[PDB]
Amino acid sequence: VLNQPSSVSGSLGQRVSITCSGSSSNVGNGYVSWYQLIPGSAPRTLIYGDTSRASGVPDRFSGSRSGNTATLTISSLQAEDEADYFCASAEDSSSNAVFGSGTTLTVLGQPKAAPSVTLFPPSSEELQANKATLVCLISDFYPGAVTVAWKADSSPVKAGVETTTPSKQSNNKYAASSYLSLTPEQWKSHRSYSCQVTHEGSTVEKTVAPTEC
Amino acid sequence: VQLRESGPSLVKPSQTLSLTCTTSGFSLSDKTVGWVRQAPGRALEWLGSIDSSGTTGYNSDLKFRLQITKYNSENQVSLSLIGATTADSATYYCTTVHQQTRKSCPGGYTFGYDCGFHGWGSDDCYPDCSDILNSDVVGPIDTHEFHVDAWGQGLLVTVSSASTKGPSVFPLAPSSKSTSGGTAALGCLVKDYFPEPVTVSWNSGALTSGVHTFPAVLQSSGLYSLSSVVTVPSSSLGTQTYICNVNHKPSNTKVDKKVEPKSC
Ligand SMILES: [K+]
């Protein structure tokens, strides 16, 4: 494994460098490549032979090497550059390839944005199947950190909660989801349920009730 | 080129994981085909490759478990990994790769061939062409060249003794209280499937703006669930039909669920 920093960040318009440190038998052999992994897409080759750009790669992505350390430099950072970057090299033979440990690039400076929250009660179809899931969808927020808490009536609920880690939407804002699994009897035995989302010290709460729909 | 991985999504511990790579038309007979994998949260890892002549090269650490085979007549390349464990759960990609060892001479030297030495010494490096037995001859510099030219989409393979389960799909219907003025969110809940993954589209791909499919959660039962959501104009809810298309390739299941707005 070649050694990269687990994370780097820069602001829009600025320049960042991702290093890849190896040994004289891999990076020092002088033919390093770089790869871009966007969540959801297949890997994309960016750089080969230390410095050569793959087709479609703008000039603001540049590769270089000094001894046993190679560097990917991204200038004029754009929001679309957020991704995982990996280096690679042959080691002692063209068939023995090694990859770097990966670097998550965070691009800073986009506008803050408060979450929109939609809470769905169990569907009629799910209840007739003798199940009940409340679905709390959290969308269009930045930055990407939220806390989610569930209440039955007004008391906290921890059993039966699952929450996903926020990840970016196609419009470059974050979204997340949370779930409260109940039996149909528990669902019917309370007057209301709530999902409350805390973002940057402020809280949005949505409520549903068995008697309202 | 467009490479396609196929094979079982689920493999029991100690059984053999097998995959096949095919194209959408391009020939693989003149290209080197390789396999790369990435386990959740881990780095890319090289597995091996097979060149046009049928010669294979493997990751040293896995050479004893791997077998890569080529079938020119079917335009196919296969991979096998014996003794599967949970460490082998990963997304598996087939690729075409550039793989070769370039020989070059140090600065100021010339290959024997360029000196007229077409037999003995033609592949050595000479400071000049005076003598085929020049004592100042040196060996060539080896540059091992590797990069991935084309990448497949990847096939997630899970290693587990639990059994496949296809999903139950439930509507997340918009309601009078749940709109946002001009727009409304509606969705699909895709419950209790194994293994990953599920993918979701809307109206067979004709609806792409506003769509987000969330990552899966793992429940205590060992079964996954996720949701998908789309934002549409609130005015269209009485007239436009909305269907989520759910694809669960590990169970060979597709579900088209119509999502009806509530009367509430
Ligand atoms: K060498």
Residue numbers in the entry:
A (entry chain L): 3 to 9, 11 to 27, 27A, 27B, 28 to 95, 95A, 95B, 96 to 106, ...
B (entry chain H): 2 to 82, 82A, 82B, 82C, 83 to 262
From the paper:
The ElsE Fabs all have CDRH3s with 54 amino acids and 4 cysteines, with a 1–3, 2–4 connectivity, Bess7 has a 61-amino acid CDRH3 with 8 cysteines (1–6, 2–5, 3–7, 4–8 connectivity), while the 55-amino acid CDRH3 knob region for Bess 4 (6 Cys, 1–3, 2–5, 4–6 connectivity) has no ordered electron density in the crystal structure. Ultralong bovine CDRH3 knob regions fold with 3 short β-strands connected by 2 loops (Loop1, Loop2) of varying lengths that can adopt a multitude of different secondary structures, including loops, helices and β-turns. The ElsE series of Fabs all have highly similar knob structures as expected from their high sequence similarity. Flexibility in the stalk is evident in a comparison of the ElsE family of structures that have similar CDRH3 knob sequences and structures, but very different orientations of knob domains with respect to the body of the Fab. The ability of the knobs to twist and rotate with respect to the body of the Fab likely enhances the ability of bovine Fabs to access recessed epitopes. To assess epitope specificities of the recombinant mAbs, Bess4 and ElseE2 were selected as Bess and ElsE representatives for competition biolayer interferometry (BLI) against a panel of human antibodies that target known bnAb epitopes on the Env trimer of virus 25710. The BLI experiments demonstrated competition of Bess and ElsE representatives with antibodies CAP256-VRC26.09 and PGT145. To better understand and define the epitope recognized, we chose Bess4 and ElsE2 as representatives to look at the effect of V2-apex epitope mutations on BG505 virus neutralization. Bess4 and ElsE2 neutralization titers were knocked out or reduced 30- to almost 400-fold for Bess4 and ElsE2, respectively, when mutations at position N156, N160, and K169 were introduced. Human bnAbs PGT145, PG9, and CAP256-VRC26.09 are similarly affected by mutations at these residues on the V2-apex epitope, suggesting Bess and ElsE bind to the V2- apex of the trimer spike.
